[PDB]
Design a protein around this ligand. Structure first.
Ligand code: BCL
Ligand code: BCL
Ligand SMILES: CC[C@H]1c2cc3[nH]c4c(c3C)C(=O)[C@H](C(=O)OC)c4c3nc(cc4[nH]c(cc(n2)[C@@H]1C)c(C(C)=O)c4C)[C@@H](C)[C@@H]3CCC(=O)OC/C=C(\C)CCC[C@H](C)CCC[C@H](C)CCCC(C)C
Ligand SMILES: CC[C@H]1c2cc3[nH]c4c(c3C)C(=O)[C@H](C(=O)OC)c4c3nc(cc4[nH]c(cc(n2)[C@@H]1C)c(C(C)=O)c4C)[C@@H](C)[C@@H]3CCC(=O)OC/C=C(\C)CCC[C@H](C)CCC[C@H](C)CCCC(C)C
Ligand SMILES: CC[C@H]1c2cc3[nH]c4c(c3C)C(=O)[C@H](C(=O)OC)c4c3nc(cc4[nH]c(cc(n2)[C@@H]1C)c(C(C)=O)c4C)[C@@H](C)[C@@H]3CCC(=O)OC/C=C(\C)CCC[C@H](C)CCC[C@H](C)CCCC(C)C
Ligand SMILES: COC1=C(OC)C(=O)C(C/C=C(\C)CC/C=C(\C)CC/C=C(\C)CC/C=C(\C)CC/C=C(\C)CC/C=C(\C)CC/C=C(/C)CC/C=C(\C)CC/C=C(\C)CCC=C(C)C)=C(C)C1=O
Ligand SMILES: COC(C)(C)C(=O)C/C=C(\C)CC/C=C(\C)CC/C=C(\C)CCCC/C(C)=C/CCC(C)CC/C=C(\C)CCC=C(C)C
Ligand SMILES: COC(C)(C)C(=O)C/C=C(\C)CC/C=C(\C)CC/C=C(\C)CCCC/C(C)=C/CCC(C)CC/C=C(\C)CCC=C(C)C
Ligand SMILES: COC(C)(C)C(=O)C/C=C(\C)CC/C=C(\C)CC/C=C(\C)CCCC/C(C)=C/CCC(C)CC/C=C(\C)CCC=C(C)C
Ligand SMILES: COC(C)(C)C(=O)C/C=C(\C)CC/C=C(\C)CC/C=C(\C)CCCC/C(C)=C/CC[C@H](C)CC/C=C(\C)CCC=C(C)C
Ligand SMILES: COC(C)(C)C(=O)C/C=C(\C)CC/C=C(\C)CC/C=C(\C)CCCC/C(C)=C\CCC(C)CC/C=C(\C)CCC=C(C)C
Ligand SMILES: [Fe+3]
Lengths: 51, 255, 51, 325, 102, 44, 273, 51, 44, 51, 44, 51, 44
């Protein structure tokens, strides 16, 4: 029975999760899409001149 | 084609002539950009012993409209501030200054204003350029969301009042300022906010730079129908100083 | 170990539980996708066909 | 986040602005009629029109239309007047300069006459447009900076099409009127006279083009970042310095050790852009008339790199190894 | 010197023919590719079966690989005296088309 | 006696007593799922 | 030495990391954590370049050339005299560029401005990283990057352009070239208009924004405004950079034939007779 | 040598500790990677070859 | 006495003692690691 | 030579110390890397060849 | 007396004493390292 | 000349000292690198040859 | 008396004495190094 703690001391619950979510869901997952878009078609090259 | 001596042909001569021309042009361009803020000073206000590699330019004159006279540059710094509430943190040069009292109220740091003229900017007709929408003939909202009547939200999440009017630029057909009416709990009178520091939503207007308790100390205009250049500089500097001075965590390192 | 409960005297439980739930999901989804992208572990091999 | 000032939040509309006037009576030649576009109002001004009608503008319009129509009808006749095949091969067609065997003489209509007539009309149109841009600034009692910067591009235009073919003695040195066919001319010109990379004036032109793009990026970002202090009103900041100019200067002073003024940055911009076609035209005019192989010129003046390793694939791998056998 | 350049590789019937009476990739003369044109304008400005998807001249393979015309276009000194009859950028375009074919 | 959150020692203990059970149930379910999946296809 | 109006802006605070351990100036330059890192990386890279030049045999600025390794090394580390120096210098350059951007962010924060300039610099950084990291990674060898020499990095561009035969037929190259030309034209027009307003003929008063708006509506029938021109210039320059990066990244890993062949989809649509 | 403690009268420890941690971790990672880039000291390849 | 950070003499001494203790422990661990690595695969 | 202590009446130690700290580490990294690019003094390759 | 930094004579003397104490220890360590390296692989 | 001490009445010692330090280090590095580009004075290569 | 930097005559003399001492020490070390190098590998 503690409702007198929440209503007395209120902030924002959803702010830190939004960070976690825009970090992995955002950056990590989209990086995968972009890499796995061009790399599925592998390429090999033959050298015919000086480096 | 033949060569004057060695490998010297017309192309080489053109290249060397361009080199000389470019040196002269660089000198001219650098000199033209030293008409404001010179000569240099040290941190104690005295003239510095070093002044640079490039000498100062000669004087040029502007002729202003609406009978304001002439402006000759380079000259004396007429936009200089007189009494700054600042303190030194070292006996030499190259270290920061520390505010003496309240940086937001004293106009130092990112809250700094420049001493502009105490007159409004005019249009081609000779009238004040920025006018409240209640006194502009034939103007109206044509697209987007109308913010009049919506409540205003502070940076810490407090409702301070309502938007009562908009001040627009008649010559360029653009909104410049938003006028607010403060609640009695958060001050008295009306204040202006620049359009570039607000976000208009479907149910509210958000101002994130300053907090709820900072809204009563925003500088006010002398007249309800016009604003001078000094007043604008003082108002916009106040709103920009809060991005660093509103909260102690905004100034300390973020890591 | 007996005094591990004092963590809630440092961090706010309300903003911790939501972030933890937002992390455990977006971890499980990543692991499931990693399993799917392989051949031996794709279970949509016994699936994707009906006799 | 904070507002970034890329798209306007709300738009307002009032009576249309018909423009300023003086004793020169500009209102006499202006059209009546204006419009408003709310789609372009998100990024800039919404008002469309009016426009000024003079003799130079009308002459330029007529001659340019004639040049366009001559090129188009020649391209249409070259394909048998078949509209679907005209559309199918639009990017590959062109009106071709004369053959090298005619020198500077007038060729037949079949082998360059139409090309000469179209070139004459285009030249008239461009010169008339430049005259119009000069006259408008003269009648507005302003400076002549716009005309001088348009004349810097006209210099490279004229060198490409008129001066160099006369110096070389053949109308066959000009550029064909077509899309893929003029990009073929660019590549063939580079191949014919050695390597245009080793032309020092081509390198200077590239320097100035890169610098102008860099400068516009810097200036646009800087002005947008001080707009919260009313920085986009540049003329009043020139006449009466404010805190926007001071912050804009101090940013670059603390970054790279020197800065500009609000008026002096536009001089930098004006020179970097205009210096591109001038150096380009100087470089183009020297090719073929003075220098015929730019790589050999670089070897003579000792700035061509030297390579030690060998040439050919058999010095690095094997045909079976590449195929994976 | 060509067919045995690196190893023992000959030619038989099953090198041009591959089971067909008419071998694939044979070419004809198509030089006038546009109408109402007379000279250098008569051979190039069109995407044809001989030009390699470009608008470069379709005249090649008939002046070079059937007739005997010069392919080289470069000057062999940094400064030379240009004469009429010397190669121009149009000869360079024809050589560019041939090299695209190669 | 630190409290950056406005709780008192006994309230934090009661909260932790529920958090621990909530964690142990998840752990047991995960253990059973991993046992089943290993039975399907071993990886060690 | 300070400017006449500079002292009231030189206050303490506004750092991402470091506090006042590095919060000072050296001459006109601001120093911070990222100033320290910039100095370290840039100095190490320059000194290593000159060591490689001394071991090559020439100190001529036109002739110095430090090259990446052979294709047979793949994505591994080469001997320092056969390509490893290039890799170390590449790492140093990436570190230096990122430190420069973060220093700009700290200066912006201290002055109370927006962060448009570091964001705009990030696009140039992205183009460089595409040239030296992403494309060689997709192609499978560090030896696909361009060499570090004033005149030898033009030979790389030439040979890479001619490996797809006729590179002008690349559509993304067309878009990038168009954006470059349009950006330059817009910059010329903007500078000219502002200078012409501020500098009238002798004996004449100065002009205002109404005059500029009138000149361009008379000239061409439309005026973009004094706020729209800066947005348009920034957008054009950023588009130029982005499409340059795209055009180079599609040439190696996505398309292998010559570029004229790509238009065969248009040349052979069923809608034609 | 006995007065080296006066370095903390010049530099703030709160700011020194973070920078020192960053420097030490980056140095450790760089040295481990340098060892991994060779052949004689790459312990992932040695395990494969030896067994 | 000269002080830019606001600490006193005694506080600086007390802090330096603990900092030296941490430095010595770190160095001892590193020495043991280097000895083991040299025994396994010697350079020099 | 006995008055060399007067340099600290010209220069503040706060800037000087950071300058010296950057310079010394730069020097050390440069010298070690220069040694690593020769044949006679590359200790990683010497260890491999000696085995 | 000339003082751009605000320090006195005694403060400068103390600072220089500690600074040179650090310098000599650094130099002694470097000398030992150089001697060991020369014994391992001479360069003269 | 005994009047050479008056150079400090015209130049600030703080800026001259910094410029002199930079100049001297760059000059020393330049000379040391010029020596190593020759065959007769490269001490690393001489050490390698003498073994 | 002319002075751009704000110094005095006596201050300039005192500074110049120490500057010259440092210069002479630097030069002596350089001379010894050059002599050792000349004995090792002559260049004249
Ligand atoms: C045979 C040659 C081919 C050809 C081959 C190629 C190839 C191949 C490439 C292009 C590329 C480009 N081509 Mg093309 N191209 C050809 C002909 C043309 C023609 C023409 C005929 O007029 C034009 C106008 C162009 C122009 C262009 C641009 C669209 C583009 C340039 C990249 C850029 O600006 O990124 C600008 C971005 C950067 C890389 C700059 C990075 C800056 C960094 C971040 C900062 C460094 C700081 C520095 C060290 C500080 C020093 C100063 C201090 C004081 C120390 N090409 C011919 C037909 N072209 C290039 C491209 O798009 O690559 C991206 C490319 O690789
Ligand atoms: C294989 C191709 C060759 C090459 C061949 C050439 C040739 C050939 C030329 C260029 C030229 C240029 N090259 Mg190069 N060039 C190459 C590769 C490159 C690369 C690269 C690889 O990165 C780059 C960045 C460049 C860049 C450049 C530019 C810097 C320069 C063009 C000047 C200018 O301002 O153009 C802007 C263009 C103009 C201003 C033209 C004039 C336009 C006029 C004003 C238009 C009038 C209006 C019109 C008629 C009416 C329109 C109607 C409307 C609807 C109303 N080159 C390679 C090596 N280069 C030019 C130059 O100057 O060389 C020295 C040139 O002639
Ligand atoms: C990139 C710079 C070039 C340029 C572009 C340009 N021309 C323009 C515009 C622009 C951006 C206009 O906005 C304006 C216009 O109305 O376009 C639709 C116009 C115009 N200026 C013109 C002349 C003109 N300018 C020229 C020059 C140039 N202006 C430059 C070369 C030339 C040349 C190439 O020599 C000519 C022929 C016509 C192309 C057009 C005529 C406009 C006019 O007569 O008065 C203003 C418009 C009205 C009468 C009212 C609205 C009717 C519009 C003509 C149609 C669109 C209305 C619609 C409701 C809005 C849709 C959005 C539009 C943006 C398309
Ligand atoms: C400093 C050099 C840079 C530069 C500068 C520059 N260009 C300029 C100027 C300046 C300073 C002008 O003042 C002038 C201008 O009017 O700008 C708005 C111009 C200009 N630069 C132009 C083109 C141009 N500039 C280029 C380059 C550059 N310009 C450089 C990068 C390039 C290339 C290849 O990069 C091109 C293609 C024009 C838009 C304009 C010159 C207009 C002109 O001379 O028009 C003559 C008129 C005709 C030929 C009539 C054409 C008839 C048409 C077939 C129809 C009528 C027009 C209609 C509006 C178009 C169709 C509209 C449709 C909706 C129907
Ligand atoms: C579309 C984006 C355009 C752009 C934007 C842009 N550039 C920018 C900015 C912006 C917005 C800045 O704010 C920033 C700046 O401060 O400018 C003054 C900058 C900047 N862009 C610059 C240059 C530059 N920009 C270029 C291009 C562009 N910049 C684009 C066209 C180019 C080219 C090739 O076109 C160059 C050369 C610098 C002047 C500056 C930032 C440079 C800087 O301070 O870097 C920090 C590091 C050092 C001091 C030196 C590091 C040295 C290395 C460790 C060693 C050398 C390595 C290198 C790879 C060797 C190359 C050899 C060559 C022969 C190839
Ligand atoms: C309206 O608005 C606007 C303005 O305003 C009004 C503007 O102005 C501008 C700006 C535009 C212009 C000025 C136009 C001209 C611009 C260009 C042509 C752009 C191209 C620019 C260049 C070619 C030059 C750029 C120069 C660069 C990048 C190099 C400068 C950098 C350095 C020298 C190093 C920086 C220093 C650092 C990091 C601090 C030192 C580090 C430390 C750890 C300090 C400790 C000390 C030491 C180790 C030793 C001492 C160090 C010293 C002396 C530092 C110097 C280094 C040396 C080696 C001596 C714009 C756009 C604008 O729109
Ligand atoms: C092989 O080479 C490469 C580069 C690939 C590498 O792999 C390199 C790898 C490295 C260089 C790795 C380096 C790794 C380290 C330096 C690791 C260091 C790790 C630690 C120091 C870990 C510390 C962990 C401590 C933990 C988990 C503590 C937990 C504490 C608690 C759960 C208690 C919570 C506290 C409470 C409740 C306080 C009570 C509250 C009151 C109010 C009283
Ligand atoms: C081989 O060639 C190449 C280039 C590849 C190299 O690898 C070259 C490498 C180098 C040149 C490397 C150089 C490396 C160094 C110079 C390294 C230096 C390292 C140190 C000086 C490390 C110091 C570490 C110190 C530590 C860990 C100290 C303390 C730690 C603590 C936890 C102490 C905690 C303190 C407290 C609590 C004080 C609180 C007190 C109060 C009173 C509140
Ligand atoms: C061979 O060719 C190439 C180019 C490859 C080279 O290698 C060329 C190389 C050179 C040209 C190299 C040149 C090198 C130098 C000039 C080196 C100079 C080095 C020094 C001057 C080093 C000085 C070091 C001094 C130190 C470490 C001093 C003190 C350290 C302390 C920890 C003291 C701390 C002091 C305190 C706490 C004082 C506090 C007291 C109070 C009262 C507050
Ligand atoms: C071979 O060809 C090539 C091009 C390769 C070359 O190598 C050509 C090379 C040259 C042309 C080289 C030319 C080189 C020079 C001209 C070099 C000159 C060098 C000097 C003049 C050096 C002077 C150094 C002096 C110093 C270090 C003196 C003193 C320093 C201090 C004393 C520091 C202490 C100062 C104090 C305490 C002052 C404070 C006093 C108070 C009273 C407050
Ligand atoms: C038939 O269908 C209709 C009616 C719809 C049409 O009209 C359709 C029309 C088309 C589809 C038209 C398409 C047109 C093009 C694709 C045109 C492309 C044109 C170019 C790329 C032109 C480039 C021109 C010039 C260049 C690159 C440089 C310089 C040129 C000049 C300086 C020209 C000037 C010439 C002079 C001065 C010579 C005059 C000679 C005298 C003797 C006075
Ligand atoms: Fe501007």
């Amino acid at each position: 029975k503690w409702f007198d703690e929440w209503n007395s001391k209120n902030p924002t619950d959803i702010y830190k999760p939004a960070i976690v979510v825009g970090v992995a869901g955002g950056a990590v997952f989209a990086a995968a899409l972009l890499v796995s878009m061009g790399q599925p078609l592998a390429t090999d090259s033959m050298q015919t001149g000086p480096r | 084609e033949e060569t004057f001596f060695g490998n010297f042909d017309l192309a080489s001569l053109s290249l060397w002539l361009f080199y000389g021309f470019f040196a002269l042009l660089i000198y001219y361009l650098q000199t033209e950009n030293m008409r404001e803020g010179y000569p240099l000073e040290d941190e104690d206000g005295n003239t510095a012993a070093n002044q640079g590699p490039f000498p100062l330019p000669k004087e040029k004159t502007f002729k202003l409209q609406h009978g304001r006279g002439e402006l000759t540059l380079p000259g004396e710094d007429v936009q200089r501030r007189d009494n700054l509430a600042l303190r030194k943190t070292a006996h030499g040069n190259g270290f920061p200054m520390e505010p003496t009292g309240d940086p937001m109220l004293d106009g130092v740091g990112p809250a700094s204003w420049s001493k502009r003229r105490d007159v409004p900017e005019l249009d081609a007709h000779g009238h004040p350029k920025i006018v409240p929408m209640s006194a502009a003939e034939g103007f109206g909202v044509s697209a987007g969301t109308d913010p009049r009547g919506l409540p205003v939200m502070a940076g810490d999440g407090e409702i301070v009042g309502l938007v009562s009017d908009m001040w627009i630029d008649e010559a360029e057909q653009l909104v410049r300022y938003l006028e607010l009416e403060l609640d009695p709990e958060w001050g008295d009178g009306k204040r202006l906010v620049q359009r570039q520091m607000v976000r208009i939503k479907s149910d509210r207007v958000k101002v994130r730079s300053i907090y709820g308790k900072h809204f009563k100390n925003v500088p006010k205009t002398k007249s309800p129908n016009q604003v001078t250049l000094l007043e604008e500089d003082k108002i916009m500097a106040y709103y920009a100083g809060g991005t660093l001075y509103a909260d102690e965590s905004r100034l300390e390192p973020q890591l | 170990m007996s005094k591990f409960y004092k963590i809630w005297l440092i961090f706010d439980p309300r903003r911790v539980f939501v972030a933890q739930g937002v992390f455990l999901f977006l971890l499980a989804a990543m692991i499931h996708l990693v399993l799917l992208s392989t051949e031996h572990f794709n279970w949509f091999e016994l699936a994707a066909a009906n006799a | 986040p904070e507002y970034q000032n890329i798209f306007t939040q709300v738009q307002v509309q009032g009576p249309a602005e018909l423009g300023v006037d003086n004793e020169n009576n500009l209102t006499e030649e202006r059209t009546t009629g204006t419009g408003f576009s709310q789609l372009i109002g998100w990024i800039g001004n919404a008002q469309l029109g009016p426009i000024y009608l003079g003799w130079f503008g009308i002459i330029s319009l007529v001659t340019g239309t004639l040049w366009f129509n001559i090129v188009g009808f020649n391209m249409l006749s070259q394909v048998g007047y078949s509209i679907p095949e005209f559309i199918r091969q639009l990017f590959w067609l062109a009106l071709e300069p004369p053959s090298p065997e005619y020198g500077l003489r007038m060729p037949p209509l079949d082998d360059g006459g139409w090309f000469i007539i179209a070139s004459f009309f285009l030249l008239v149109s461009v010169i008339s447009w430049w005259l119009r841009t000069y006259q408008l600034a003269e009648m507005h009692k302003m400076g002549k900076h716009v005309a001088w910067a348009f004349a810097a591009a006209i210099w490279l235009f004229l060198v490409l099409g008129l001066f160099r073919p006369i110096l070389m003695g053949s109308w066959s040195e000009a550029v064909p009127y077509g899309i893929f066919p003029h990009l073929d001319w660019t590549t063939a010109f580079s191949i014919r006279y050695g390597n245009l990379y080793y032309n020092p004036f081509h390198a200077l032109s590239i320097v100035f083009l890169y610098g102008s793009v860099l400068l516009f990026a810097m200036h646009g970002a800087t002005i947008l970042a001080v707009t919260r202090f009313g920085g986009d009103r540049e003329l009043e900041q020139i006449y009466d310095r404010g805190t926007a100019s001071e912050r804009a200067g101090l940013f670059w002073r603390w970054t790279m050790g020197f800065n500009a003024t609000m008026e002096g940055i536009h001089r930098w911009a004006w020179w970097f852009a205009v210096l591109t076609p001038i150096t380009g035209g100087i470089g183009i005019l020297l090719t073929g008339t003075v220098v015929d192989n730019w790589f050999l010129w670089a070897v003579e003046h000792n700035f061509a790199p030297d390579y030690t390793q060998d040439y050919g694939y058999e010095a690095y791998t094997t045909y079976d190894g590449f195929l994976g056998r | 010197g060509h067919v045995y350049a690196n190893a023992e590789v000959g030619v038989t019937c099953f090198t041009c023919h591959r089971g067909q009476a008419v071998p694939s990739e044979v070419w004809y003369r198509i030089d006038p590719v546009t109408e109402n044109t007379s000279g250098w304008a008569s051979v190039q400005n069109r995407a044809t079966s001989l030009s390699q998807f470009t608008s470069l001249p379709s005249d090649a393979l008939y002046q070079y690989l059937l007739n005997y015309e010069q392919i080289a276009v470069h000057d062999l000194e940094s400064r030379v005296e240009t004469l009429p009859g010397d190669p121009t950028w149009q000869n360079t375009e024809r050589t560019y088309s041939l090299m695209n074919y190669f | 006696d630190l409290s950056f959150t406005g709780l008192t020692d006994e309230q934090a203990q009661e909260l932790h007593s529920v958090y621990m059970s909530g964690l142990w149930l998840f752990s047991a379910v995960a253990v059973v799922a991993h046992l089943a999946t290993f039975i399907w296809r071993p990886w060690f | 030495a300070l400017l006449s109006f500079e002292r009231k802006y030189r206050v303490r605070g506004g750092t991402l990391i470091g506090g006042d351990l590095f919060d000072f100036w050296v001459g006109p330059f601001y120093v911070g954590f990222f100033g320290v890192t910039t100095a370290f990386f840039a100095l190490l890279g320059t000194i290593l370049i000159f060591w490689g030049a001394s071991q090559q045999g020439t100190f001529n600025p036109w002739l110095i050339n430090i090259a990446p390794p052979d294709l047979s090394y793949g994505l591994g580390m080469a001997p320092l005299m056969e390509g490893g120096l290039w890799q170390i210098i590449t790492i140093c350059a990436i570190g230096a560029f990122v430190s420069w951007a973060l220093r700009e962010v700290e200066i912006c924060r201290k002055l109370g401005m927006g962060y448009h300039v570091p964001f705009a610099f990030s696009v140039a950084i992205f183009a460089y990283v595409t040239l030296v990291v992403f494309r060689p990674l997709l192609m499978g060898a560090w030896g696909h990057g361009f060499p570090y020499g004033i005149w030898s990095h033009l030979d790389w561009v030439s040979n890479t352009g001619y490996a797809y035969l006729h590179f002008h037929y690349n559509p993304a190259h067309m878009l990038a070239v168009t954006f470059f030309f349009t950006t330059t034209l817009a910059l010329a027009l903007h500078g000219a208009l502002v200078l012409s307003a501020a500098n009238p003929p002798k004996g004449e008063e100065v002009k205002g924004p109404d005059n500029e708006d009138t000149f361009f509506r008379d000239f061409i029938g439309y005026s973009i405004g004094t706020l729209g021109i800066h947005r348009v210039g920034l957008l054009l320059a950023l588009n130029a950079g982005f499409w340059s990066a795209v055009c180079i990244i599609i040439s190696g890993p996505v398309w292998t034939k010559g570029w004229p062949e790509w238009w065969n989809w248009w040349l052979e649509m069923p809608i034609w007779p």
